[PDB]
Amino acid sequence: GVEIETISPGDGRTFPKKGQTCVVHYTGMLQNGKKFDSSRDRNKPFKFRIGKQEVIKGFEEGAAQMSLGQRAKLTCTPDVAYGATGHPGVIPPNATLIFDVELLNLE
Domains and CATH numbers, the chain: 1-81 (3.10.50.40)
- If you write DSSP's letter for every residue of 26-41 in order, what string do you get? -EEEETTS----BHHH
**Data resolution in angstroms:** 4.3
Distance CA 50, CA 20 (A): 6
Q: Which residues of 65-104 are buried (b: 16+ CB within 10 A; e: fewer)?
A: ebbbebbbebbbebebbbbeeeeeeebeeebbbbbbbbbe
Burial of 9 per CB tally in 10 Å (0-12, 13-18, 19+): exposed
Length of the chain: 107
Distance CA 25, CA 80 (A): 21
Task: Give 25-28's long-range contacts (Cβ < 8 A, gap of 24+).
Answer: 25/102, 25/104, 26/59, 26/99, 26/100, 26/101, 26/102, 27/99, 27/100, 27/101, 28/97, 28/98, 28/99
Distance CA 14, CA 40 (A): 23
Chain centre to alpha carbon of residue 40: 13
Query: What residues act catalytically?
Result: 26, 36-37, 56, 82, 99
